[PDB]
Amino acid sequence: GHMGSSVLEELVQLVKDKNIDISIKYDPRKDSEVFANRVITDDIELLKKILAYFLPEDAILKGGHYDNQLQNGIKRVKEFLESSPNTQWELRAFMAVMHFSLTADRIDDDILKVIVDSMNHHGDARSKLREELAELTAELKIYSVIQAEINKHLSSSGTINIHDKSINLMDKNLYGYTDEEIFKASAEYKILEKMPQTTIQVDGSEKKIVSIKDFLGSENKRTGALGNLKNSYSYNLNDLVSQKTTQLSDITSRFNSAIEALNRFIQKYDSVMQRL
């Protein structure tokens, strides 16, 4: 990796350039009494102690010949800081950036940014991750229903209709529900209620469904739209669905792992504050 000089001086200059300060603020989920914000970028000795949790004194004060992990880690911490200029950061957010960039515990930019923004806006990042994971998990569940129906026709060399003779993705029974009100409270329903509907006639009455085509072609989901969709497919798309399902499954798996890693980080942060 490259040569560097003092990480302390580098960060001090950056937060000055970008008009950032970093403060410990009261957290109602952790602290017993409310206290005034403690600005740690106003106390260089305290800032050095915080950096020393992650870095050796050598890097903090003098720089040196950094390994690739460290050079890349510092670059990433700087980019996270620069992404939220003119802000009073919470220390927990800055420490999360450090922890999830410099250590063996790694979270990718997409998820780490969600965490950091939550912390900086005085939220509970655990709650934010849970909410995101629930939506992704429900979208994946819907895709698994679609995949199962496709695979049935592929196995039988048959023809799946994804339009007016589609399975109805709004049928609670596809997701294990036996009560409509309970289904309407589900993460699945929250996705499905945003989807286009197709009108079909049953026994001379109109019935609304969410067709496979309605769902797949919709922009209002994490995986985005599939285009050029036909009303039926014969096996005497399935690749695109498999790709989207794999992408979605990856994101869901990473959110899941991020919840475990954030739990551990919060324990570490609490431990470090005790030493401060």
Strands 3-4, 64-65: pairing is antiparallel
What is the 8-class DSSP label of residue 40?
G
Resolution reached, in Å?
1.6
CA distance 18 to 87: 9
Q: Are 264 and 107 in contact (CB under 8 A)?
A: no
DSSP calls for 94-132: HHHHHHHHHSS----HHHHHHHHHHHHTT--HHHHHHHH
Q: Can you give the C-alpha Rg of the chain in angstroms?
A: 25
What is the 8-class DSSP label of residue 59?
H
Q: Are 120 and 253 in contact (CB under 8 A)?
A: no
What is the 8-class DSSP label of residue 163?
S
Q: How many whole angstroms from its chain centre is CA 116? A: 11
Q: Which residue has tokens 């798309």?
A: 237
Cα pseudo-dihedral 150, 153, 154, 159, rounded to 10: -100
Torsion sign over Cα 119, 122, 123, 124? positive
Name all contacts of 71-79 with Cβ < 8 Å and 24+ positions apart. 71/1, 71/2, 71/4, 72/1, 72/101, 73/101, 73/102, 74/4, 74/7, 74/10, 74/102, 76/101, 76/109, 77/11, 77/101, 77/102, 78/10, 78/11, 78/14
Strands 232-234, 159-161: pairing is antiparallel
The H or E element that residue 8 is part of is helix 7-17
Burial 160-179 (b: 16+ CB within 10 A, else e): bbbbeebbbbbebebbebee
Question: Where exactly are the structural domains of the chain?
Answer: 1-276
